[PDB]
């Protein structure tokens, strides 16, 4: 079954758990390269009632540091909120809960704007199939395959 946190068919329980990054894409390649603050590789999802407790890691020369955040609902259906690096919205496109999840964050800092989307996997790596699905949705909200990183082997 295939949900967006925007449908009425929406279950957040469903992605509370065990999740990591497999591909980073953005408007502004710089945020999501090698020294980017939004190069962040998701561990786990924790659903709380009007809240989601974030928990990543950041990797410098495979030393790899702790950080955790917490998002929380916004008056619109299915969206959240956070700051971090400026202030962020964020909703879920397209998830089956099993397996994959696919987000879309718009962040906002001193007048100006961009745009990151990623796919992330209950497990390490995921299927060309769905890593070109995501390509395809990246590509309908104006990112080009330049700007998509796949990070499947720098992600452990
Ligand atoms: C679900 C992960 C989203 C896209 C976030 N990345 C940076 C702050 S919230």
């Known amino acids: 079954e295939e949900a967006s946190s ?3 068919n929406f279950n957040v329980e469903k ?7 497999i591909i980073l894409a953005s408007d502004k390649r710089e945020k999501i390269e090698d020294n980017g603050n939004f ?3 998701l561990e786990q999802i924790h ?9 990543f890691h950041t990797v410098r020369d ?20 956070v700051t971090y690096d400026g202030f962020n919205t964020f909703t879920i496109p397209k998830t089956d809960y099993d397996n994959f999840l696919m987000a879309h964050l718009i962040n906002e800092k ?3 704007t961009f745009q990151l989307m990623g796919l992330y996997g209950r497990e390490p790596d995921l299927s060309s199939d769905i890593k070109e699905r995501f390509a395809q949705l990246c590509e309908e909200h104006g990112i080009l395959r330049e700007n998509i990183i796949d990070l499947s082997n720098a992600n452990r």
């Not at 992605?15 to 990054?21: A, D, F, Y």
């Not at 790899?64 to 998002?71: D, G, K, Y």
């Open 15 to 21: 992605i509370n758990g065990e999740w990591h990054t």
């Open 62 to 81: 495979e030393e790899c540091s702790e950080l955790s955040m917490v998002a929380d609902k916004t008056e619109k259906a299915g969206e959240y909120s």
């Open 47 to 55: 659903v709380l009632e009007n809240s989601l407790v974030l928990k």
């Open 6 to 8: 925007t449908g009425r």
């Open 39 to 41: 190069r962040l590789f």
């Open 110 to 112: 001193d007048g100006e």
